């Protein structure tokens, strides 16, 4: 029998199993019946278009439950402005095109955008606000956030992890309506763009207003040098006010930075390295107050020492705990003789992320591996005393379950040492991160390795990677490379290219992230005898056309003084040679002349300039991006045939 003769119910069921958007688009072109099934089955839509032609919006997506309006071109452009009275129509427009929206993501450039678009769906359940631009001036705090509180509203999840605002705006909005704050079952405030995190009083007010929070994430300030820093009282108030918490993620803002120079105690000029206002007894009380906790994250930029007893209490008082992430928590594993202690007693953990533990040694790693025998993901950052022997033995202990390993900033564990340590799980590991450190002193098929993340200092080469041990990866499909450093002090590279052609060693590689955004250099003018960022972009992007990449995310290096991340001529020219590209996202700026280079790529469909960093370019005057240039580029790309 053929597929068309099947009952329509199972046709809907089979079509609902197709989550790939490209294949759904292909399936909608088969026949009228397939078209109707796809249109009535599609559940999530990320809108792709320009602000100008929003009134050319199709009405065929009447069944989408998740709508993402945050990528409307031009990226970050105000969706609704008070300068145009017809902007209100946009609200109705959206409300009529997607009447079944329960989850909404929207770029909230202006308060009017929120006030007009968000209240359109009374049945809205999840809301995500995105804003990387500057905060518009309001009479009081949280005036724009107060626009979320609708009469027929029932918002349950609020996500502000990418919405830049003042930390005073959240408690002001949450305290203005008890019903809105009480209905929230999730609250994400884990935003790295805050100049400073939430104060102690702000955390207390937020938790007091929201007694039903099941998930709570926040960027707080734990540095005791500042006045109002979150400490023991804030954590106790969190535990008291929200007894139903299942996910608790508290982090210092600096701990959320992309650059390691902002949170690593060693790379900061003496910053950090001082005790925080967090005691072991305080943590014991907090953990006693949270019986339903399932995921815990305490990523601080100040030391918390002798925290072993609290983590021992975690095992007995939080039976549902599965994931733990610790930042600068010391004394986590201090085994004596052979008795386990500390985090080694949390046998129920499934993933564990560790950062900056001075006490940890090889025996500590052995204890963690022997105790947490259910561990499936392990991440260790900045441990100066662990070596290849301890990590290798820990990997052998967890060989049956460990499939995700990250080893970063470990002084005695370079690339070669990390790859030798991960040998017992070489045929089972699926995700892997190493630091491309080639200066560390002192049957090989990665059968199931699928994703490799690399961190490398600016000016270093990628060629030794194959010699490091990562040689035969038949299933490797996506590689993420992050480059960080200050190139204003380096001379010109003696070797012409960074060595992306090395990645030709992997036959199934098709997706890449090349994050050079944390390279600081000179944009358009160097003082004397110096090299601008165009030279480094050429150095890093040579050979990218030889790879058979179909998706590429590129982060151009920035000039911190001028605050620009412009694409250069070599960068555009080298990205132009990638014929097989399907999606190309550049996280910077580029003017019309360089953007028009990408029309040569025949198969290119998704191209966008996404300035998803703080602060984003405020207007067309401050950078080389223009709305007309974006519109012309979009028109030229769509009409290609």
């Amino acid at each position: 029998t053929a597929l068309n003769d099947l009952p329509d119910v199972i046709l809907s069921n089979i079509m609902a199993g197709v989550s790939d958007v490209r294949s759904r688009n292909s399936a909608s072109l088969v026949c009228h019946k397939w078209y109707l099934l796809e249109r009535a089955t599609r559940s999530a839509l990320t809108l792709r278009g320009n602000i100008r032609d929003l009134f050319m919006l199709p009405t065929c997506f009447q069944s989408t439950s998740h709508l993402d309006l945050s990528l409307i071109s031009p990226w970050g452009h105000p969706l609704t402005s008070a300068a145009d009275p017809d902007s209100a129509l946009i609200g109705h427009l959206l409300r009529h095109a997607f009447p079944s929206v329960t989850s909404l993501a929207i770029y909230a450039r202006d308060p009017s955008t929120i006030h007009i678009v968000v209240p359109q769906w009374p049945d809205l359940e999840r809301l995500k606000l995105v804003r990387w631009h500057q905060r518009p001036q309001t009479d009081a705090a949280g005036d724009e956030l107060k626009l979320l509180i609708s009469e027929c509203g029932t918002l349950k999840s609020l996500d502000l992890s990418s919405f830049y605002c003042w930390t005073d705006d959240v408690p002001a909005a949450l305290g203005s309506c008890p019903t809105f704050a009480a209905n929230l079952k999730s609250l994400n405030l884990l935003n790295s763009s805050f100049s400073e995190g939430f104060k102690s009083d702000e955390i207390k007010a937020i938790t007091k207003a929201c007694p039903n929070l099941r998930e709570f994430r926040a960027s707080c300030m734990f540095d005791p040098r500042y006045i109002g820093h979150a400490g023991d009282e804030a954590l106790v108030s969190i535990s008291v006010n929200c007894p139903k918490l299942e996910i608790l993620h508290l982090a210092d803002t600096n701990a959320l930075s992309s650059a390691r120079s902002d949170f690593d105690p060693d790379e900061r000029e003496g910053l950090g390295q001082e005790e925080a206002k967090i005691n072991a007894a305080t943590l014991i009380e907090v953990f006693s107050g949270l019986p339903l906790l399932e995921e815990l994250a305490l990523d601080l930029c100040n030391n918390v020492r002798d925290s072993g007893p609290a983590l021992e209490v975690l095992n007995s008082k939080c039976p549902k705990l599965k994931s733990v992430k610790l930042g600068q928590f010391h004394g986590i594993s201090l085994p004596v003789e052979s008795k386990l202690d500390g985090i080694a007693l949390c046998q129920g953990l499934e993933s564990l992320s560790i950062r900056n533990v001075d006490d940890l040694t090889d025996m500590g790693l052995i204890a963690i591996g022997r105790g947490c025998y259910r561990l499936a993901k392990f991440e260790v950052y900045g441990c100066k005393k662990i070596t290849v022997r301890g990590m290798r033995t820990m990997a052998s202990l967890l060989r049956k379950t460990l499939v995700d390993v990250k080893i970063a900033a470990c002084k005695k564990l370079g690339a070669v040492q990390s790859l030798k340590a991960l040998e017992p799980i070489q045929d089972r590991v699926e995700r892997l991160h190493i630091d491309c450190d080639w200066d560390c002193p002192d049957d090989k098929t990665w059968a199931r390795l699928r994703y490799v993340s690399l961190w490398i200092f600016v000016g270093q080469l990628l060629t030794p990677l194959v010699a490091a041990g990562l040689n035969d990866c038949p299933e490797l499909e996506e590689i993420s490379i992050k480059v960080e450093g200050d190139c204003r002090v380096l001379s010109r590279p003696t070797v012409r290219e960074f060595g992306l052609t090395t990645l030709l060693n992997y036959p199934k590689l098709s997706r890449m992230h090349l994050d050079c955004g944390d390279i600081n250099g000179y944009a358009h003018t160097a003082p004397s005898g110096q090299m601008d960022l165009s030279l480094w972009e050429r150095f890093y992007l040579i050979g990218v056309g030889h790879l058979g990449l179909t998706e590429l995310n590129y982060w151009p290096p920035q000039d911190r003084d001028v605050n620009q991340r412009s694409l250069s001529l070599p960068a555009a020219g080298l990205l132009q040679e990638c014929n097989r590209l399907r999606k190309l996202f550049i996280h910077g700026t580029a003017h019309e002349h360089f953007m028009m280079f990408f029309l040569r790529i025949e198969g290119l469909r998704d191209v966008q300039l996404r300035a998803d960093y703080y602060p984003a370019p405020e207007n067309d005057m401050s950078t080389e991006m223009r709305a007309d240039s974006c519109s012309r580029f979009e028109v030229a790309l769509n009409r290609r045939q």
């Binding site: 029998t1 053929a2 597929l3 068309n4 099947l6 009952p7 199972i10 069921n13 089979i14 079509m15 199993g17 197709v18 790939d20 958007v21 490209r22 294949s23 688009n25 292909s26 399936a27 909608s28 072109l29 088969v30 026949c31 009228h32 397939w34 078209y35 839509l45 990320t46 809108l47 792709r48 278009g49 919006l57 199709p58 065929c60 993402d68 990528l71 999606k583 469909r605 998704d606 769509n638």
Partner: protein, 130 residues
């Protein structure tokens, strides 16, 4: 318990295996809507579900398209959620990674879209970030 196929063949079914199917559990017990190989192919999977799993499942689904269609029809008749969802996902995997013409070629579907209709549907599809 003994079940009877449409052609008249009789098979033996475990009590838990019988409870796997909602229709069988809720109701000799003849089955006049399924063939013998339908039972012969569903019994082992149901028994395993009563009791390496991914490899065994991949070896289980290595069957022809017509056989998979018979299996999904049988699962719909038996109202077995797990089998129906798994087989629907398997058939949906055949949809992904192919152009509309390839899909028509594989599933023998006649094309009734006029060029203007195809242009309109592609224009609508262009509003979605893939």
């Amino acid at each position: 318990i003994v079940l009877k196929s449409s052609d008249g063949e009789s098979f033996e079914v475990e009590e838990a295996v019988a409870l796997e199917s909602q229709t069988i559990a809720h109701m000799g017990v003849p089955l006049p809507n399924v063939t013998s190989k339908i039972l012969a192919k569903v019994i082992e999977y149901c028994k395993r579900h009563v009791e390496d799993l991914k490899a065994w499942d991949a070896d289980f689904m290595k069957i022809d398209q017509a056989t998979l269609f018979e299996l999904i029809l049988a699962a719909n008749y038996l109202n077995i959620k797990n089998l129906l969802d798994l087989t629907c996902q398997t058939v949906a995997d055949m949809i992904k990674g192919k152009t509309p013409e390839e899909i028509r070629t594989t599933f023998n579907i006649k094309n009734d879209f006029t060029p203007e209709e195809e242009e309109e549907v592609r224009r609508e599809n262009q509003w979605a970030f893939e």
